[PDB]
Ligand binder design. Sequence first.
Ligand SMILES: O=C(O)C[C@]1(O)CCCC[C@H]1Cc1ccccc1Cl
Length: 133
Amino acid sequence: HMCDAFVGTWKLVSSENFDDYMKEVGVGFATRKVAGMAKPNMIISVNGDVITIKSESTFKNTEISFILGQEFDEVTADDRKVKSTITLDGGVLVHVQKWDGKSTTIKRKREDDKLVVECVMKGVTSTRVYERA
Ligand SMILES: O=C(O)C[C@]1(O)CCCC[C@H]1Cc1ccccc1Cl
C-alpha cells in the first residue's frame, strides 16, 4: 500500500521552467523543442514490491520498473544512460539519476488532486503538474 495514492493514469497539465531544466541537464536544441511540446500520460502501477512508471508521449515513450532503494539502469527520454535509485522519503518518491559525474533529482508528490513532479539540476528546478486522466 506504499504508493497507493500515486497509482493511476495521470496527464500533464502545466509546466514551468522545463526548458531551463533540460538545458542544465545537457539536452540539445532540437530535443528540447520537441520534448517541450509533449503532454505525456504518466501511468504508475504497483505489483508487490515492484513499482512501474510509464510515460506515454508524442516525444518518447519510457518505462521504468524498480524496487525502492535498489539501483537500476535507466535510458532517459533524452537518451542519457543513467544509474537510478528511487526511495520514499516522507511520502515523496525521490529519484536520483547519476551519469557522467552529474546528478539530477526528480521528486514526485501528491498534492490535493494533483501529482507534482519537481525536477532539479544544480540550481535549476522545473515543476510539472499532472492531474488524473
Ligand atoms: O515529462 C515529465 O513530466 C517528467 C519526465 O518524463 C521525467 C522526469 C524528468 C523530466 C522528464 C523526462 C525528460 C528528461 C530530459 C529531457 C526530456 C524529458 Cl521528457
